[PDB]
Short mmCIF file of N, CA and C in Angstrom, two decimals:
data_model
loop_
_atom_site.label_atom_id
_atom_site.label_comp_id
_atom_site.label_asym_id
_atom_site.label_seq_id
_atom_site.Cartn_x
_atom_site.Cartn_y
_atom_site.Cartn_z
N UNK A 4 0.82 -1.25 0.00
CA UNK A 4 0.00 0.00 0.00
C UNK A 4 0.84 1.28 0.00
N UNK A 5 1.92 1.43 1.07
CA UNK A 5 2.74 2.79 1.50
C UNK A 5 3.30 2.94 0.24
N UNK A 6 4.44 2.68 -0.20
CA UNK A 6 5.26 2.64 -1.63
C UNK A 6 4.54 2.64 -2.86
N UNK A 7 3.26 2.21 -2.88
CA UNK A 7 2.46 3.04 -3.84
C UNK A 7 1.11 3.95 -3.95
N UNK A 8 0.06 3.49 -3.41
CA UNK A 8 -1.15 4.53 -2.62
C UNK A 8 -1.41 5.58 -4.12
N UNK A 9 -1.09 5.57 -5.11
CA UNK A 9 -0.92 5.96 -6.26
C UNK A 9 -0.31 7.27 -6.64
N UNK A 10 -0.28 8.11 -5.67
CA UNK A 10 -0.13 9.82 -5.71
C UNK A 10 0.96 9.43 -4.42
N UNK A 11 1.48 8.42 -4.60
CA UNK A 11 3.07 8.45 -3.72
C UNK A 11 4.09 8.23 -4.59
N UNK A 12 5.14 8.68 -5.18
CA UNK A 12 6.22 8.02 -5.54
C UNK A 12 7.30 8.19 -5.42
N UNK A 13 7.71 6.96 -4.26
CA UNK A 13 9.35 6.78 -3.55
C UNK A 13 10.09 7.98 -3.16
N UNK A 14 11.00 8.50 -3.41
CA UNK A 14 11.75 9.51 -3.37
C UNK A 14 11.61 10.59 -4.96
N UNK A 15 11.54 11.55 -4.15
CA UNK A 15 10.92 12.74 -5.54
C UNK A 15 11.54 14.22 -5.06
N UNK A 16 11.80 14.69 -6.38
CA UNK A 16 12.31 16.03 -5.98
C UNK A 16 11.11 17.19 -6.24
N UNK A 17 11.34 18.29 -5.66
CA UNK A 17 10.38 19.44 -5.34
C UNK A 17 10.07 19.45 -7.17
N UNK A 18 11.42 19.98 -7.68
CA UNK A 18 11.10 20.30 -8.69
C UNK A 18 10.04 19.26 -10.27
N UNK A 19 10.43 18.68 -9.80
CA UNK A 19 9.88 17.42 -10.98
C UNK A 19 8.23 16.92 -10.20
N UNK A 20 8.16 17.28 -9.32
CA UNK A 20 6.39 17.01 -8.80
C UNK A 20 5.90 18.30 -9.42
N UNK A 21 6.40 19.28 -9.11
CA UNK A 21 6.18 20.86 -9.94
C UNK A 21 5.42 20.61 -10.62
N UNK A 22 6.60 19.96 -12.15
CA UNK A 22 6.35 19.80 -13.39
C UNK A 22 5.23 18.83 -13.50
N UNK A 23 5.61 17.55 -12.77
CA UNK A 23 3.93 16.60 -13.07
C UNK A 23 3.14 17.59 -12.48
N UNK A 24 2.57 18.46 -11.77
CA UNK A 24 1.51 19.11 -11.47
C UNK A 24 1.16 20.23 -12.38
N UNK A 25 1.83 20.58 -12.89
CA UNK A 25 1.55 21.46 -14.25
C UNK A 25 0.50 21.38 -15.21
N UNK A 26 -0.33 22.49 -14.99
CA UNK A 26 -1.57 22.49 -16.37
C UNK A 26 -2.86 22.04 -15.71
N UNK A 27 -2.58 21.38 -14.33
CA UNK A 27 -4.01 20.51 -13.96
C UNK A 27 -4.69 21.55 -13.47
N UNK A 28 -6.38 20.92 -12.87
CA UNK A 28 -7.41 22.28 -12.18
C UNK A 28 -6.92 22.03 -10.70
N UNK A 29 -8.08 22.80 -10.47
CA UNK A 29 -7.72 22.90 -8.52
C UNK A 29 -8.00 21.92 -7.90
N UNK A 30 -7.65 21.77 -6.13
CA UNK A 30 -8.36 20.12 -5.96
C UNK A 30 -7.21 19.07 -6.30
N UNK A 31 -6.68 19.39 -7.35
CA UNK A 31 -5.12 18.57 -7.75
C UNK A 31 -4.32 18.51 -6.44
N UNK A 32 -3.85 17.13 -6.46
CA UNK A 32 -2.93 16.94 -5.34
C UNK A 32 -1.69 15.57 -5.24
N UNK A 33 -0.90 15.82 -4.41
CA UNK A 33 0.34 14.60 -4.61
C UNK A 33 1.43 14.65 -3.38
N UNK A 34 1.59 13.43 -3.38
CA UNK A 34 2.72 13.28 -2.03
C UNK A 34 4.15 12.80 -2.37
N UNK A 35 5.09 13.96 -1.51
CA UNK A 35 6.18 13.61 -2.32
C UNK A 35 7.05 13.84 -0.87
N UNK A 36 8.42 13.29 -1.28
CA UNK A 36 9.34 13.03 -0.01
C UNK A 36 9.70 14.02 0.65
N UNK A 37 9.94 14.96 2.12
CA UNK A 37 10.56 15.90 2.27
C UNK A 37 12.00 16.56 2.28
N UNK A 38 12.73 17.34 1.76
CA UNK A 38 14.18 17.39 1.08
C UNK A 38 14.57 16.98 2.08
N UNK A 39 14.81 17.29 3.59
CA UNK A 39 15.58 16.46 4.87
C UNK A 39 14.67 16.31 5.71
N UNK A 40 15.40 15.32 6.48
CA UNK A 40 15.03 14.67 7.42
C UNK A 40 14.70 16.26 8.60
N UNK A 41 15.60 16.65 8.82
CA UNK A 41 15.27 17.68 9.73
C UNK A 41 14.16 18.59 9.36
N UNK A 42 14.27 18.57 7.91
CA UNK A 42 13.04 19.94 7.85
C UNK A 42 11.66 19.14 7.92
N UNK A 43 11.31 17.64 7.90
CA UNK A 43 10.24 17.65 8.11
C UNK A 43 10.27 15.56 7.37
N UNK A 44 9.01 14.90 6.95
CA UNK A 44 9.09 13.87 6.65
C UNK A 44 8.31 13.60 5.29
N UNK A 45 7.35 14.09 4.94
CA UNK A 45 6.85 14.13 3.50
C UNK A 45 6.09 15.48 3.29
N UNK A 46 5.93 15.92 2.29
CA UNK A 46 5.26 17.01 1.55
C UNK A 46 3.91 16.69 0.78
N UNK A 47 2.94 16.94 1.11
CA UNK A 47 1.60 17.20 0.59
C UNK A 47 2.05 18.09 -0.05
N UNK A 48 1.57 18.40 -1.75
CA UNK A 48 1.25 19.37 -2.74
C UNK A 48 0.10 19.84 -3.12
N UNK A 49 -0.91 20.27 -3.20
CA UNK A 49 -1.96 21.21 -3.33
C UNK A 49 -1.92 21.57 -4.76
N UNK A 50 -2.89 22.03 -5.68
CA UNK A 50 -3.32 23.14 -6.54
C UNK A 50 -4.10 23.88 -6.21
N UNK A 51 -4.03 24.73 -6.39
CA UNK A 51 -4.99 25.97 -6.17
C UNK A 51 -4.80 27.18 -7.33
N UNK A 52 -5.18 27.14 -8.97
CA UNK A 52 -4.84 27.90 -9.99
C UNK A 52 -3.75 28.18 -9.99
N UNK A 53 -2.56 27.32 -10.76
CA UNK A 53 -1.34 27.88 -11.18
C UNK A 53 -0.32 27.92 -9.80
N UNK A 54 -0.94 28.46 -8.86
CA UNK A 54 -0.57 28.50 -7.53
C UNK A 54 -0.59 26.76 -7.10
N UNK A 55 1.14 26.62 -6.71
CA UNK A 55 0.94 25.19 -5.79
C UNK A 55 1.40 25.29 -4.12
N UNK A 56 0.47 24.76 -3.52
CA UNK A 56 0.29 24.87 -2.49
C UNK A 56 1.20 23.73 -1.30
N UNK A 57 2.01 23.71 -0.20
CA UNK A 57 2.93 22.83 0.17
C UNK A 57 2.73 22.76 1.55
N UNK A 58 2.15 21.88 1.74
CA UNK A 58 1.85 21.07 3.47
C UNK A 58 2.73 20.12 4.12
N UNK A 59 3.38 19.98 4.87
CA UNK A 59 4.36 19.32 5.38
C UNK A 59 3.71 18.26 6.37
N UNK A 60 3.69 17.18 5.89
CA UNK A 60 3.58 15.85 7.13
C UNK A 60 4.78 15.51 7.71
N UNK A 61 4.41 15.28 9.34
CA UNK A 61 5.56 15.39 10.37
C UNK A 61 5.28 14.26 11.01
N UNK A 62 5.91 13.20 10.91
CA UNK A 62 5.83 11.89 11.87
C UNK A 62 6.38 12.00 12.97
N UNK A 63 5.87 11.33 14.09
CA UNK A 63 6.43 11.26 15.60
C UNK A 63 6.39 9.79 16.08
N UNK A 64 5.68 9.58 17.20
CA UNK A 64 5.50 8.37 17.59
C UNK A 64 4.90 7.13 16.55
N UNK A 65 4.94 7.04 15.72
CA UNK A 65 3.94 6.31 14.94
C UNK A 65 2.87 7.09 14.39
N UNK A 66 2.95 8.31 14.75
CA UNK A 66 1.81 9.13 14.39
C UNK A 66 2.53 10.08 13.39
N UNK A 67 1.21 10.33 12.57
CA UNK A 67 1.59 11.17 11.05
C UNK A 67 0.71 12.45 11.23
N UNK A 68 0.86 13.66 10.93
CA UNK A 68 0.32 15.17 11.41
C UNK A 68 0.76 16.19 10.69
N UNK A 69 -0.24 17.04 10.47
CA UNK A 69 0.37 18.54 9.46
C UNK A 69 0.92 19.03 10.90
N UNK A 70 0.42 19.41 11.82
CA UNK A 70 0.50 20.47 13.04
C UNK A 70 0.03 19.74 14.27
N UNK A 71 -1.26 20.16 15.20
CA UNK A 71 -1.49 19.80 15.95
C UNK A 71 -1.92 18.37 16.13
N UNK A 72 -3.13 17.99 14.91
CA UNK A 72 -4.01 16.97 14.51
C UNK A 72 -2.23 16.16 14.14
N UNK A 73 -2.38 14.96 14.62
CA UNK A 73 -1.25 14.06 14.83
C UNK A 73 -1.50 12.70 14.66
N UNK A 74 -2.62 12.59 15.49
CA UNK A 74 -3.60 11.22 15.69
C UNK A 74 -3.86 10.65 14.42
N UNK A 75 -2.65 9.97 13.93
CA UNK A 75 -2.96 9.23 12.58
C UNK A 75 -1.63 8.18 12.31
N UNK A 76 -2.24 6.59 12.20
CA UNK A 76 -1.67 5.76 12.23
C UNK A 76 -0.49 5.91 11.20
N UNK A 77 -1.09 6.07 9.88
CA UNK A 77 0.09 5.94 8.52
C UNK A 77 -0.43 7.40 7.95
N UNK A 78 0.96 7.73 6.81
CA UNK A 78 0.72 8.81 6.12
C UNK A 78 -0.67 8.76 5.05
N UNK A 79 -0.51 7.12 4.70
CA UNK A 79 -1.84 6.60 3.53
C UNK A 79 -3.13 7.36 3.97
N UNK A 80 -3.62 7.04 5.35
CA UNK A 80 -5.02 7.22 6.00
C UNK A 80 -5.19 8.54 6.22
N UNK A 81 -3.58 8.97 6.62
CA UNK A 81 -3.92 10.33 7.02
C UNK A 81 -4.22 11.76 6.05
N UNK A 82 -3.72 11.12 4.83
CA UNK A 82 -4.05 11.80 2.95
C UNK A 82 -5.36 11.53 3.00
N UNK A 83 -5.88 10.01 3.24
CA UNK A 83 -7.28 9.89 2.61
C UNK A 83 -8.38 10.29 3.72
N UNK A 84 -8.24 10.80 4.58
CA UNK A 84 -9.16 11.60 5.36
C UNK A 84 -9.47 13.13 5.09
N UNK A 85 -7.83 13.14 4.45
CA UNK A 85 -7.48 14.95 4.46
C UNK A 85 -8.18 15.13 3.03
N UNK A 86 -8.32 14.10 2.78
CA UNK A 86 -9.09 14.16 1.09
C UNK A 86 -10.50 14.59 1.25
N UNK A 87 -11.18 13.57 2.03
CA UNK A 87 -12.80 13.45 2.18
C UNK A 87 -13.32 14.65 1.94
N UNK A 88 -12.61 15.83 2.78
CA UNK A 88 -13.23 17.24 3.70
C UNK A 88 -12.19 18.22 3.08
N UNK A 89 -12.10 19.17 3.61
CA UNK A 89 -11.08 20.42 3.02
C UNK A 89 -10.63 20.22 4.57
N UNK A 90 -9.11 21.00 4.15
CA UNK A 90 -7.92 20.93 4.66
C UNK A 90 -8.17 22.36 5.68
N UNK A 91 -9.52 23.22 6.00
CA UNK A 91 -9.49 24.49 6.46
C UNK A 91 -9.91 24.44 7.71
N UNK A 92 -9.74 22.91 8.52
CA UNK A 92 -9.70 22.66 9.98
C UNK A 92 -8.31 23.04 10.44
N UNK A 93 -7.67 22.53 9.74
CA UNK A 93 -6.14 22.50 9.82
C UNK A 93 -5.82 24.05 9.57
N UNK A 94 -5.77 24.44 8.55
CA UNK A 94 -5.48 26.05 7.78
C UNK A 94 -6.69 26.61 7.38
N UNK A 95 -7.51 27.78 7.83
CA UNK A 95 -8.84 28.49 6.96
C UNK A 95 -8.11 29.10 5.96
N UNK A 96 -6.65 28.96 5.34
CA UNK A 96 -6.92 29.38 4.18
C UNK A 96 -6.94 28.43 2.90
N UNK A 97 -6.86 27.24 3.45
CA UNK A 97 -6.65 25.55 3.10
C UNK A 97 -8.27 25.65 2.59
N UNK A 98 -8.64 26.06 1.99
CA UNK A 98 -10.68 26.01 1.93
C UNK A 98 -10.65 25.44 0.41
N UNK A 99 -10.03 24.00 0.53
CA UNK A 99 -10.28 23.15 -0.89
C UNK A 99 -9.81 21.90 -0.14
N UNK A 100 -10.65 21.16 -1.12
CA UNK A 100 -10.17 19.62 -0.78
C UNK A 100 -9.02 18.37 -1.51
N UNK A 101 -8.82 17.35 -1.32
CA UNK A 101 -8.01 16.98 -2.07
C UNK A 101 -8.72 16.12 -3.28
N UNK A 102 -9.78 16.47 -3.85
CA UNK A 102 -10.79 15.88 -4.62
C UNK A 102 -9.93 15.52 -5.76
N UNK A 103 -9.74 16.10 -6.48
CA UNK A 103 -8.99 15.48 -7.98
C UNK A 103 -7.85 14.93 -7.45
N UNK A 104 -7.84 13.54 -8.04
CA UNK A 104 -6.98 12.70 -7.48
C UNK A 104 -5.58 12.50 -8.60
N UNK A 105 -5.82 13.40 -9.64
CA UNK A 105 -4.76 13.53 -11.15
C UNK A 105 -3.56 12.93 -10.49
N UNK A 106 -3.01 11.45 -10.52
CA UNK A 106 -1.74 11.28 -9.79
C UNK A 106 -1.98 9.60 -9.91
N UNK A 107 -2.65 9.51 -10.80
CA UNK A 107 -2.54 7.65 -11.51
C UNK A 107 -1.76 7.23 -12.33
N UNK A 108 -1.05 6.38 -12.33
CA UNK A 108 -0.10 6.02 -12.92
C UNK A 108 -0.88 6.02 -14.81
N UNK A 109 -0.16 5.83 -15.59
CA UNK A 109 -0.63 6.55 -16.70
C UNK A 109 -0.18 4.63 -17.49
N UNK A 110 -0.64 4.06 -16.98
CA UNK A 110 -0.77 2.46 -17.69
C UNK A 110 -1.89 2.26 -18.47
N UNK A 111 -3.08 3.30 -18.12
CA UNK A 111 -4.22 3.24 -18.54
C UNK A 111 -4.24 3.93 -19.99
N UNK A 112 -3.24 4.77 -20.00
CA UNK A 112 -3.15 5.07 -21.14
C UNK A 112 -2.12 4.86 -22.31
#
């Protein structure tokens, strides 16, 4: 599940998630590795028009968390909750959800 979850892939640089996020609508979203260990543990990406948006997941005890909200077993569950609802519990300026899921592997096509 972790190593793929479909809108995960392995180790990724800032710049080249950029580029796959390029051109899509809002609602667009993707999880990508964080550059160090110290600054943090994975990166949520956002669209929001042209504008990309960058959320930092921070693991601790077993638990996965943007900020306060922590209480989350794996990074997988803790994306697909943050999906359901908008992200503006966490941030009111976060007032979109992670609805377009644009981040499938492209076998289908």
């Amino acid at each position: 599940s972790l190593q793929d979850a479909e809108w995960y892939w392995g180790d990724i640089s800032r710049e080249e998630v950029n580029e796959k996020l390029r051109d899509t609508a809002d609602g667009t979203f993707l999880v990508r590795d964080a550059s160090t260990k110290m600054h943090g543990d994975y990166t949520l990406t956002l669209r929001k028009g042209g504008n990309n948006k960058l959320i930092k997941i921070f693991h601790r005890d077993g638990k996965y968390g943007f900020s306060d909200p922590l209480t989350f077993s794996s990074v997988v569950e803790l994306i697909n909750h943050y999906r359901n609802e908008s992200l503006a519990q966490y941030n009111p300026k976060l007032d979109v959800k992670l609805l377009y899921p644009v981040s499938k592997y492209q076998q289908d096509q």
